[PDB]
Structure formats: structure tokens, C-alpha cells
């Protein structure tokens, strides 16, 4: 019996920054 | 024995971008 | 045998936005 399963990890971090943009024009 | 774990990975990437904005107006 | 792995995942998204800003002054 048992064994199985394992494997996966990895992946994740990343994320974050966004936002931000718009404003310019005028002048 | 041995057996379980696995799963999780996936997710990851993304983030960057942001910054900018600000300026505009007068004229 | 087998077991282990599992974890990481999660994070990604964000991204986009930036840009714009610049402009503004004159009048």
C-alpha cells in the first residue's frame, strides 16, 4: 500500500504592481 | 508509507505594470 | 514511495495599468 501522490509544487509568487496609468493631457 | 502531497502549482506570473499616472491638466 | 510535492501555488494577477502620466504645465 501507500505510495501515490507527489508531484505539484511549484507555481505561486508573482502578483502585485497594477494600478497606476491614467492622468497625461493637457499642457 | 510514503504517499499524500501533491497538488498545489498553478498561480505564479502576473505582476509588473503600475507606475505612471500624474501630470495632465494646465493647458 | 511517492509523497511529497504539494505546496507553492497562489500569487499571480495583478499586472496592467502604467503608462500615462506626462502633460500638464502650459496655461
Same mark, same amino acid.
Given at each position: 500500500?501507500? *505510495?501515490?501522490? #507527489?508531484?505539484? #509544487?511549484?507555481?505561486?509568487?508573482? *502578483?502585485?504592481? #497594477?494600478?497606476? #496609468?491614467?492622468? !497625461?493631457?493637457? !499642457?
Amino acid at each position: 500500500x501507500x *505510495g501515490x501522490x #507527489g508531484x505539484x #509544487g511549484x507555481x505561486g509568487x508573482x *502578483g502585485x504592481x #497594477g494600478x497606476x #496609468g491614467x492622468x !497625461g493631457x493637457x !499642457g
